[PDB]
Amino acid sequence: MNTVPFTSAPIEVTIGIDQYSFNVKENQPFHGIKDIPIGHVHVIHFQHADNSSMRYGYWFDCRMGNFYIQYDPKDGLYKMMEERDGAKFENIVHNFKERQMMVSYPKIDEDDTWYNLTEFVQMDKIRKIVRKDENQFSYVDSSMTTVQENELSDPAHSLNYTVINFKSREAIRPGHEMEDFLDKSYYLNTVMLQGIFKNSSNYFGELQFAFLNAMFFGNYGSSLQWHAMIELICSSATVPKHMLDKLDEILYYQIKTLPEQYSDILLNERVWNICLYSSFQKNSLHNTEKIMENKYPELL
Amino acid sequence: GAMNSSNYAELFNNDIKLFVDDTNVYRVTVHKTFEGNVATKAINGCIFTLNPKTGHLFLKIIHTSVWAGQKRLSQLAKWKTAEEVSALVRSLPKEEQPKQIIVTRKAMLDPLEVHMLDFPNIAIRPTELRLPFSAAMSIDKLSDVVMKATEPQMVLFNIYDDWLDRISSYTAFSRLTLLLRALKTNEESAKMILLSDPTITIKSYHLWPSFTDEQWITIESQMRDLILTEYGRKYNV
Ligand SMILES: O=C(O)c1ccc(C(F)F)cc1
């Protein structure tokens, strides 16, 4: 298990770590989060108490570097930093872990939720969507736009998700206009999976990362991307059987984790009704259909 | 976006545009079978593609052979229409290609948009106007070429005959829509109005009779009376 220590916590803030959250009071003796499970990506996130504007946070993997958080009072936010040298870092942290002022990552032993939400997510692929090569961790916030949103404005501060557009020449082969528009299999299997993603694991990783950025930051472009990637599969008549069974598992845990009270803003009624009741795969997502009907029957 | 009664003069400006009406593409008769079931029989159809400024009508005749062995024909018909309009645009010299294509039915928007992705500068638009172009097959010379066709064919007409020598395209379109609305509402009475007088004939190279300016006023009045008459009969007014 690894630790993200804090220099201090000078402003009152709600801190998220993966699907957990806790409040820190202005100048409370908080020195970070400890017992973070090795083996998974993680996200540490923030929403200031005095200004719920800009949710922001950092995607990291403790296997890649020694990471701490210090509040920068000029830019007004908690920043992730990297200590390159292990001995210096180990000396500062053990002090605080002896003085007991860290929240323990509260992993229940039965619980596979975080693994189920990040099964296909890798730091290396995160760092390609979020471009800032000099850090091993990736900053994301509420207001960051995606490359597709920019085409429809700073490109350095953007989320470089794979663009999906059903009415684009990339999606439609000349001579196959009706075929490719009504059955997205070409676009899914040849353009996206064979061409861009190389395999379904990479496609699912981006889908999972988009969902998590929508849920944890309220990032609108991320929500758009998550739904586009779902609709592309459901709108394809020809999908490998293992991909459909894994999608059902991925979506089930996403719907299970979504706060009930954010359903009006995180779920697109049109896409979900199309996917579950009209699409080619309307009968291929049994676990997701069952949780959706029992948890959010209003949306349907 | 959509085209309506506010921006109606736009139809007659100098930006090339085309209306596309797909109503008469897929046409059938419905009949009982020997076993007492019901069957359809397709008949020849057409795409109605019109430049409202010039009167140029690109009538693409849809021969029943294009449906053979195909499924979901009502859906296919929209995509076949889009395919054929796309092919027409590509066949026209650049300086003749439309800047806008207005579809009379919103179901044609996605099919035409997808077939025209190669032409991102051609706007594909719906319209709030209720246009009576489904009645084109009430024009005898158009109906005749469609039903006689034994193979796919494209035929070019001017649907305004020579009217633009004497009237504006705004007035020509208004006359056309009044004539077609009357033919749609009561075809027999409309043709009686148009053909009752043998001293007025249809030139071999025209679709409508050779009415003088004052005679067109009379005919137009009789058409409006027909429409009002049928309205009264329909709603018991
Ligand atoms: O530079 C470091 O390695 C360093 C400095 C300050 C803290 C604080 F968070 F505990 C942690 C690490």
CATH at residue B114: 3.30.420.230
Instruction: Return the residue matching tokens 């990471």.
Output: A67
Residues B131 and B235 in one domain: no
Element (H, E) at B156: strand B153-158
Task: Answer for the pair B126, B149: CB distance below 8 angstroms, yes or no.
Answer: no
Q: What is the DSSP letter of A299?
A: G
Tokens (6 digits) for A136: 């091993």
Q: What angle do CA B163, B164, B167 make, to 5 degrees?
A: 85
Residues B57 and B70 in one domain: yes
Q: Give the number of C-alpha atoms closer than 13 A to the C-alpha of residue B30, restricted to the C-beta side.
A: 2
Q: Is A4 helix (H, G, I), strand (E, B) or coil?
A: strand
Q: Where are the alpha helices (DSSP H) in chain B?
A: 73-91, 109-115, 140-148, 169-185, 187-195, 213-235
The Cα–Cα gap between A35 and A41 comes to 14
Q: Which amino acid is at B5?
A: S
The Cα–Cα gap between B68 and B8 comes to 40
Residues B171 and B156 in one domain: no
Residues B86 and B195 in one domain: no
CA of A182 to the centre of ligand 1 (A): 55
CA dist A125 to A59, A101, A148, Å?
Answer: 11, 33, 18
| Ligand 1 atom nearest to CA at A83 | 3
The Cα–Cα gap between A226 and A159 comes to 13
The Cα–Cα gap between A195 and A193 comes to 6
Length of chain A: 300
User: Best mutation site among A169, A177, A181, A183 for testing chain B: the one with the most B CBs within 10 Å?
Assistant: A177
Q: Tell me, what CATH number does A134's domain have? A: 1.25.40.550
Over the range A115-129, which residues count as b (16 or more CB within 10 Å of their CB) and which as e?
Answer: ebbbbbbebebbbeb
Last residue of a domain, one of B109, B141, B163: B163
* Cβ-based neighbour number of residue A39 at 10 Å: 8
Task: Answer for the pair A206, A153: CB distance below 8 angstroms, yes or no.
Answer: no
Residues B20 and B107 in one domain: yes
**DSSP β-ladder status, A42-48 and B17-21:** unpaired
Strand-pairing partners, residue A79, are A70
CA of A7 to the centre of ligand 1 (A): 6
Residues B150 and B173 in one domain: no
Pocket probe for ligand 1: among A62, A78, A89, A136, the residue whose CB has the most ligand atoms within 8 Å is: A89
The Cα–Cα gap between A71 and A69 comes to 7
| Ligand 1 atom nearest to CA at A5 | 9
Q: Is B83 on the interface with A (CB under 8 A)?
A: yes
Q: Where are the alpha helices (DSSP H) in A23-171?
A: 86-98, 113-118, 123-129, 147-151
Residues B71 and B117 in one domain: yes
| Structure-determination technique | X-ray
User: Best mutation site among B71, B89, B110, B114 for testing chain A: the one with the most A CBs within 10 Å?
Assistant: B114
Q: At what angle do helices B213-235 and B169-185 cross, to 10 degrees?
A: 40
Report the chain B residue with the minimal C-alpha distance to residue A181.
B114
Task: Answer for the pair B81, B98: CB distance below 8 angstroms, yes or no.
Answer: no
Nearest to A172 among B76, B83, B114 (CB): B114
In a domain, B4, yes or no: no
Pocket probe for ligand 1: among A82, A92, A101, the residue whose CB has the most ligand atoms within 8 Å is: A92
Residues B157 and B172 in one domain: no
A169 contacts B118? CB cut-off 8 A: yes
CA-nearest residue, atom 4 of ligand 1 = A89
Q: Is A167 on the interface with B (CB under 8 A)?
A: yes
Q: Is A176 on the interface with B (CB under 8 A)?
A: no
Instruction: Name which of A160, A3, A223 is nearest A97 in CA terms.
Output: A3
Instruction: Name which of A10, A57, A48 is nearest A29 in CA terms.
Output: A10
CA of A67 to the centre of ligand 1 (A): 8
User: Longest Cα pair distance anywhere in chain B, in angstroms?
Assistant: 59
Tokens (6 digits) for A147: 């490359």
The Cα–Cα gap between A125 and A202 comes to 8
Which positions ≥6 away from A278 have C-beta within 8 Å? none
Pocket of ligand 1 (CB under 6 A): A 5-7, 68, 83, 88-89, 92
The Cα–Cα gap between A216 and A143 comes to 12
Helix-, strand-, coil-residue percentages of chain A, each rounded to 5:
45, 20, 35
Element (H, E) at B59: strand B56-62
The Cα–Cα gap between A15 and A40 comes to 19
Q: Tell me, what CATH number does B176's domain have? A: 1.20.80.40
Task: Answer for the pair B48, B57: CB distance below 8 angstroms, yes or no.
Answer: yes
Q: Is A68 helix (H, G, I), strand (E, B) or coil?
A: strand
A178 contacts B117? CB cut-off 8 A: no
B76 contacts A177? CB cut-off 8 A: no
Which DSSP string do the residues of A177-218 spell out, in sequence order?
HHHHHH-THIIIIIIIIIIIISSHHHHHHHHHHHHHHHHHH-
Q: Which amino acid is at A32?
A: G
Instruction: Name which of A125, A123, A118 is nearest A137 in CA terms.
Output: A123
Q: Where are the beta strands (DSSP E) in chain A?
A: 2-5, 13-17, 20-24, 32-36, 42-48, 56-60, 66-72, 77-83, 103-104, 138-141
Task: Answer for the pair B83, B199: CB distance below 8 angstroms, yes or no.
Answer: no
CA of A92 to the centre of ligand 1 (A): 6
Q: How many domains does chain B have?
A: 2
Task: Answer for the pair A34, A196: CB distance below 8 angstroms, yes or no.
Answer: no
Report the chain A residue with the minimal C-alpha distance to residue B76.
A178
In a domain, B185, yes or no: yes
Contact residues, chain A, for B89 at CB < 8 Å? none
Provide the shortest C-alpha distance from residue B51 to chain A (in Å). Answer: 25
CA of B134 to the centre of ligand 1 (A): 77
Read off φ and ψ for residue A216, nearest 5 degrees: -85, -25
Task: Answer for the pair B112, B20: CB distance below 8 angstroms, yes or no.
Answer: yes
Q: Which amino acid is at B83?
A: E
SS (H, E, C) B14-50: CCCEEEEECCCCCEEEEEECCCCCEEEEEECEEEEEE
Task: Answer for the pair A35, A107: CB distance below 8 angstroms, yes or no.
Answer: yes
Residues B96 and B204 in one domain: no
- Rg for chain A, CA atoms, rounded: 21
The Cα–Cα gap between A119 and A111 comes to 14
Range of the domain at A239: 116-299
Range of the domain at B215: 164-237
Residues B189 and B112 in one domain: no
* Torsion-angle region of B161 (φ positive above 0: left; ψ -120 to 50: alpha; else: beta): left
* Cβ-based neighbour number of residue A157 at 10 Å: 14
Instruction: Return the residue matching tokens 């699907």.
Output: A19
The Cα–Cα gap between A141 and A16 comes to 13
* Torsion-angle region of A27 (φ positive above 0: left; ψ -120 to 50: alpha; else: beta): left
Residues B107 and B200 in one domain: no
Residues B158 and B170 in one domain: no
